[PDB]
Amino acid sequence: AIKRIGNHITKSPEDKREYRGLELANGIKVLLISDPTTDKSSAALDVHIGSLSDPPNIAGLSHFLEHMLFLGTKKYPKENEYSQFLSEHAGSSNAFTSGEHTNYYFDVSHEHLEGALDRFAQFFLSPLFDESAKDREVNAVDSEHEKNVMNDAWRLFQLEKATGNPKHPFSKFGTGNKYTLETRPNQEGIDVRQELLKFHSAYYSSNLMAVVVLGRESLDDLTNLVVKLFSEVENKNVPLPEFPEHPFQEEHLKQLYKIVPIKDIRNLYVTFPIPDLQKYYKSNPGHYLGHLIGHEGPGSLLSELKSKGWVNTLVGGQKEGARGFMFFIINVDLTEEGLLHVEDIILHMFQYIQKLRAEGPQEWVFQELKDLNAVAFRFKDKERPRGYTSKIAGILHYYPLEEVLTAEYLLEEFRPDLIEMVLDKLRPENVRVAIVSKSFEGKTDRTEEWYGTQYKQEAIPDEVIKKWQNADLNGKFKLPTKNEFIPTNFEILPLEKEATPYPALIKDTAMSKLWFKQDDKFFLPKANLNFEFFSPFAYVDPLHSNMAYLYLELLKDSLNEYAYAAELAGLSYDLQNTIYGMYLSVKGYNDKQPILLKKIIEKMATFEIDEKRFEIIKEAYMRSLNNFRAEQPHQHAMYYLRLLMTEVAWTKDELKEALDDVTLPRLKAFIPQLLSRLHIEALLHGNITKQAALGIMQMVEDTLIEHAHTKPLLPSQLVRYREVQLPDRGWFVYQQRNEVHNNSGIEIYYQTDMQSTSENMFLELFAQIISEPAFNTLRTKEQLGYIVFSGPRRANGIQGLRFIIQSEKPPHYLESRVEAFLITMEKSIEDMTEEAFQKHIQALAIRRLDKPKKLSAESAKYWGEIISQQYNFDRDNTEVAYLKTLTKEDIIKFYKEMLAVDAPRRHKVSVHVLAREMSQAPALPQPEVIQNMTEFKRGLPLFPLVKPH
Amino acid sequence: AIKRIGNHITKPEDKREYRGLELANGIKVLLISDPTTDKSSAALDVHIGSLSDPPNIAGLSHFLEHMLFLGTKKYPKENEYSQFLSEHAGSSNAFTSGEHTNYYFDVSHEHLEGALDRFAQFFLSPLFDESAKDREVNAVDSEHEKNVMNDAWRLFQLEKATGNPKHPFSKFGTGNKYTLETRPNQEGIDVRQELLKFHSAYYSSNLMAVVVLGRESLDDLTNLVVKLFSEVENKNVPLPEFPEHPFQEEHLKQLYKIVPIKDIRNLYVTFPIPDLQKYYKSNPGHYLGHLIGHEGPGSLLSELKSKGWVNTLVGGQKEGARGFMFFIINVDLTEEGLLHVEDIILHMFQYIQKLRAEGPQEWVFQELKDLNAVAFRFKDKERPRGYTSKIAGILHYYPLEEVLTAEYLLEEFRPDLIEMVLDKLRPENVRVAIVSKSFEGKTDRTEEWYGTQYKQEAIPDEVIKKWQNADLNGKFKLPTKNEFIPTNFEILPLEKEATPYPALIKDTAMSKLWFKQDDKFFLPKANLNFEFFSPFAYVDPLHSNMAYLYLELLKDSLNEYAYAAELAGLSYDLQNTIYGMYLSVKGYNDKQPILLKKIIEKMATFEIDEKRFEIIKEAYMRSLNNFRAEQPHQHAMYYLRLLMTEVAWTKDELKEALDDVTLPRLKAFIPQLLSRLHIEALLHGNITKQAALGIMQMVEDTLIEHAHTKPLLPSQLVRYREVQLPDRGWFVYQQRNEVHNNSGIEIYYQTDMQSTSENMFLELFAQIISEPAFNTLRTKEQLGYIVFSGPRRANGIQGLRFIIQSEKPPHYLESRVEAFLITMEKSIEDMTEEAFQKHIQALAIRRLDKPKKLSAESAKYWGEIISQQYNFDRDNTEVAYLKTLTKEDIIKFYKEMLAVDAPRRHKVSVHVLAREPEVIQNMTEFKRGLPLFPLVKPH
């Protein structure tokens, strides 16, 4: 079947992978990928034969064949020689099974397109399907069935397979156990391996392939390679097993089921068997419905159900199915008071159906969401070349060679008759109900045959049922508004005369401070924005910090219902409290940043509170506070760790007690006083202009002075908090007794120094040289506990070294094991060669040196300088230049006074986290107990702050 | 002439034994016997004044008393009596009045004979010599030359002369050279022979008042003075007195406009009134003085302050002669008062009509009677010198039992005398005197002797009839009986708590209570100290201004209530701190908890007025606007307390933020301010621990009752730390003054916290460089008057500071200080042991003092409360350490810490320039990255 026909393929211009689709005369869909810039070349094969295409006697045979067709060629009868040949040439093969397709996919090293594909082509001439291969593989397929017993998604998936018509060929089995695949056939005299060769030859070898090769040779050389090489496939014309009817054949309509799952969940699964729309891929009305189901907007269903407090979450939309039929599923979470009102929720579902039934289909929703799909699929980022070939081979069976990329992610036409058709489908006639909830114990008798879930009809009488049928009316539900806002203008802006590699201070006031660079590297329409809020009142009290958290909580919760569609347009955001103030980041496209950001500033600038919303947030965080009385000991240690190394820290006791007086007039009166006089600093990076950023900055500061009359701060009321000095040789400690866990925790702290260029390399390189041996020596070798950690603890511009270990040990014993490792490192200083030095410092070098892979990464790093006020933009090159400048005697000098136990500059702290009831040790100096941290920290010196770069 | 009739006089605290007696030759003698005095004393008053002079020669009795100084027949030398007082520390003094010439002196210990020998023959032989007279005429010249510009004698002689000019009240008291020896000899009068007539007949008869404060015995003193000072023999010379009031309807309803020397503004209302000296039972003129100076609800001055015309106004009885007495009213003046004079005097008439409406009052009488009972009952003491001359003044007008129990008790009530002076206090009887500087060239009627200028200026009748006819009642109502007059005068004897220092009898997270009973003084009073901490002081500069103006107007509001406390003898203090609030309560132990609880209740539930708010707001805005014009050494100490704290709101930040002060802003802040705070308490005096617990519990109970005060976490009881230095660097900056043309400078040295070593380091090294600084720097260098040095005690941290203001080159002035550094540096080892030892004894007794008041020990106890150390015998231990220093110790203290190469050189200066190391560009960016000191562990 040596035939080739292809051309240039519209390849979504961001991508550079050169394409060519063609179909071979023996029923093979072929896509030729030419990417001369890829490292790994790849190839993949999908055949339209599924786990519903199994023989009626043998279940899960196609799964067994996508295991077994790897094994055995006449050239190499060995088991993994193709797999080892790709272990030579970097190839990671895998294969999988679906209801209608069985797909194979792999890759190869750089250019090995003759070798591996010849090893893969030989499968077509001579597959072996050996005795021991089969008889161990069927145990592996039985283990695949065995691990899918307790996997609830595949258990309920097979419960979907089995609770339709048990006569319809949809009811076939997918995975295959030992017994149905290889034990019942041969005891009936059916040869399993002759079924394998029959299945392969008649069904597999005939037609319905969808192969794809990601090469980098050229278009044409791999083209006449593979069309020559894969004429070895000879047609036998298996028909496509399609289904002319849905399996819900008047036994499964208007019927209820109650299922017992493994996981303690509460869910309701409602299924509508609905006609095909694979032909209707041009408009795709079902995914348009799924766009309308789980949308959060004015008068949305989820807005109403959250407003009634019945539904935690939901999702609905088109369920893909067979060729003839498809399904329509709804997957919801339940509350306790939704559990009594599930039937009423279904009434609200019919209310939303009446909402869709009132306004009919709509054009601007379709046309604009069509445009969103258009642009976002046009400006889709990238793809991994592995998985890509399995995907496009998955959908290659269904589309002509130019429709293989804009396959369903692009919409041609408006079909209000199809939208009205599926709207007319959404009726109480078409309902199948399956409830998945754990509390159904003892009540569910009808057990699944293979996996073993248990369910029942167990219907509620017909009152509720016909009450669902008759009652088709809509209430509050309204049209969701639209947030398009020019996703066309996505083009790049070339950098100006101001050519800096770092965001520069382009605007500084006593009110503001503005850092900005536009995207040099990534060439993206997006932009990322980081924002600082300073406030005095964030760190004054438990009370005011509670007021901050509840404000930000109800604040962000309020404008979220608008924010869903805007972030659905690709504009993400964050609100987060700090000890400084609140943290705002907004990240996304250039689409609506001034507009949306303006709406944000106006929104939190003048913001109001509802009473019961305040009360629910009050109760909720009131319950969220006392959570820490049961936490993990390593967590308890990290909490006290960040507790001790700040200026003050208000406890969960004090935070929980501080909610005793928080009234809505108290907080809401406090807020404009809270917002009276602040300072804001901003980091801006991405596809924008500098002067437009200056205008956005003037916009926001003007907005703030407008609403609540924000005044600039003084740098004498702009403060940072200090870190405590040690007695320069003292090692002080205390204990905390957890209640729940019988494991004890401990964490050790070292005040080295400020981040100078020397100290960063000291602490990081030392941290890495204690990273691998300690983990190899204490958790691997000594096996102290599962929680074993080493590394840095940096606060207030001061470095540190922390170790997070929870185990069931005495903590002073465990300290002795720490000191034993300190002696081990002490000797390992002189046990380090030049090579163990140089490989390790080069490991640190590559650890430090990397360009980012997202604008958000470098924005988070530069912002990490901004929150520390550092701005040392080339700390990486400078510190690596120091890193190459270390010697061995450097680390001896770092050891003697900073790291030793007799060290005169030893600034060492540890903390015990006790349990619920709690080979060399040196002579430690005695520690003190630390009862009152206030009386402890009352007279102690303090660190400086960093002089900013 | 050995005649005596007296006994010990009912006094109780004082031990000075008293006997009054009259001698048969007409000598009234009062004997003071205090065998506990170190210095004995004596005094003589002559009740003969310049009113007994001849009308042609002025100051003749003045010149005789001047000439009675010089010369005895025993000792005819000039200053030989004065030399006997120069030997035995004796301080004599004399003066001349219209009716008195009084002498008082003392002696070293026992020296009564010497003064007798150099004083007795004054009555036998006053010499009236060549040299005595011819120098004493210059002494009279100098006497009038120093008394010419004395505004007391100027305005008083203006009172003497603006009466009847014919009456001898219009004579001149002092006399210059001109009237002494130019006017009599051109009239041919020999002064000396008149002096001999005046002393022989006139100064020998009577009206001398002898008294001796002696320690000899009852009888040694007795025959001492009675035997040898019987030399006075009666001549029955009549008393120089006036039988009429000298303001004889020439000057009534008359105004006067006086030109003063001092730039002052006053208005004077005068009533001559008959004698009520016989009626000391009710004392109606001083009872009127009680009714003038009350400032209470419905009082006149309460509305006058509410009007803004009159700042203050004193009134009451002025004494005159036996025949007449006076009634003077002295007010303060504003400018607009000069245009509203008629209405002011109308308000006076309003209050007069209120007294005429309310009639006489008995509970006011009985009340002030109780005030005289208590205040004379527990009156403390007096200076022994001058006192004896005073009661010798009281000897002429009172018998020997009434010279000591003088007016301090009230017998009977005299409503008719109240009506009598009500008839005196009438618009018909008014003399008016205006004192203003701007009436020069405007007042032609000049005073005769001194030469100030005034004017008769009869008032036109529109104002006269407005003054007469408009005597009406408006709003005013006399305030009622005060609720707190004390009866608890029973001092409590010391119980089981026999510690000499206050113990923490109660501490909670809500309250802290320290207590001691009074060991030393054993007084019915009690004094109270309280700290109320809150973190809300440093919320804003604006919130700190809120704190300030809140407590300011708060206390000022209850000040109108507090006048009864000022009337009852009960003092107090409210004061904000940068940390919190300070409450002081002082007075008797009777009714301080109930009244204090009313203070608690009132400032807990308190209201705000708008215009009082606005005024105090603008006034403190002005004071902040005025704190750009202040003293550059004080401005330097403000920079000192600025830089060496953890964080402080600046005065510009305090200044500018006051545009934001609305009444709902603070009035919303107040219950927030009163929601969570700390309470600390010191109670001291003759009281118990259990009653202190119940009273304090009552107080904090009232607090939680009104404003629901909850405690503060001890992590939210922070203090300000102090800035770490490089410990050897000397950094500096400058600030240019606006107003004053002098430059200020301060140099700072922190050693360490107050340990027992560091306190004597600081104190001893500071005082040992104090007296050579007086030797060389201030005396020799003469830089400016503001030259000061010494310690800086702040935040439980010692420091050393130097206060020098003068317009100098600042770095050269630093070099002058450096010269004094080298001076003291070499002067450490050039010091002998003697300077060392006498100096550490100087420091020792300088530091070692017994208390002198409950206030003293309470100030020391509070001085332990403010550092929270409670190191109650730091004093004794540090003194035990103080002699434990050596010369080489202070060599080490200089070299190790203070020298130029010293590693503990904590040296920093701040320049405050006149009106026109490293630099310090931004104190904020300075303090941005810097370490901080630890705090003090409380012992």
Swiss-Prot record, chain B:
Gene Ontology biological process terms in this record: amyloid-beta clearance; amyloid-beta clearance by cellular catabolic process; amyloid-beta metabolic process; antigen processing and presentation of endogenous peptide antigen via MHC class I; bradykinin catabolic process; hormone catabolic process; insulin catabolic process; insulin metabolic process
* Free-text description of this protein's post-translational modifications in UniProt: The N-terminus is blocked.
Q: Which UniProt keywords apply?
A: Allosteric enzyme, ATP-binding, Cell membrane, Cytoplasm, Host cell receptor for virus entry, Host-virus interaction, Hydrolase, Membrane, Metal-binding, Metalloprotease, Nucleotide-binding, Protease, Receptor, Secreted, Zinc
UniProt-reported outcome of changing residue 65 to Q: Loss of catalytic activity
The terms describing its cellular component in GO are: basolateral plasma membrane; cell surface; cytoplasm; cytosol; cytosolic proteasome complex; external side of plasma membrane; extracellular exosome; extracellular space
Q: What is the free-text note on the cofactor?
A: Binds 1 zinc ion per subunit.
Q: Give the record's free-text account of how this protein's activity is regulated.
A: Activated by small peptides. Activated by ATP and GTP, and to a lesser extent by CTP, TTP and PPPi. Inhibited by bacitracin. In vitro modification of Cys residues impairs enzyme activity.
| Sites of N6-succinyllysine modification | 146, 651
Task: Give its localization.
Answer: Cytoplasm, Cytosol; Cell membrane; Secreted
Q: Where is the active site?
A: 65 (proton acceptor)
What cofactor requirement does the entry state? Zn(2+)
What catalytic reaction does the record list?
A: Degradation of insulin, glucagon and other polypeptides. No action on proteins
Q: What does the UniProt entry list as the effect of changing residue 484 to A?
A: Strongly increased enzyme activity
Binding residues for Zn(2+), per the UniProt record? 62, 66, 143
Q: What class of enzyme is it?
A: hydrolase
* Subunit structure of this chain's protein: Homodimer. Can also form homotetramers. (Microbial infection) Interacts (via N-terminus) with varicella-zoster virus (VZV) envelope glycoprotein E (via N-terminus); the membrane-associated isoform may function as an entry receptor for this virus.
Which purpose does this protein serve, as stated in its record?
Answer: Plays a role in the cellular breakdown of insulin, APP peptides, IAPP peptides, natriuretic peptides, glucagon, bradykinin, kallidin, and other peptides, and thereby plays a role in intercellular peptide signaling. Substrate binding induces important conformation changes, making it possible to bind and degrade larger substrates, such as insulin. Contributes to the regulation of peptide hormone signaling cascades and regulation of blood glucose homeostasis via its role in the degradation of insulin, glucagon and IAPP.
Q: What else is known?
A: ATP-binding induces a conformation change.
- Provide the domain comment: The SlyX motif may be involved in the non-conventional secretion of the protein.
Protein name in the entry: Insulin-degrading enzyme
Gene source species: Homo sapiens
Higher taxonomy: Eukaryota, Metazoa, Chordata, Craniata, Vertebrata
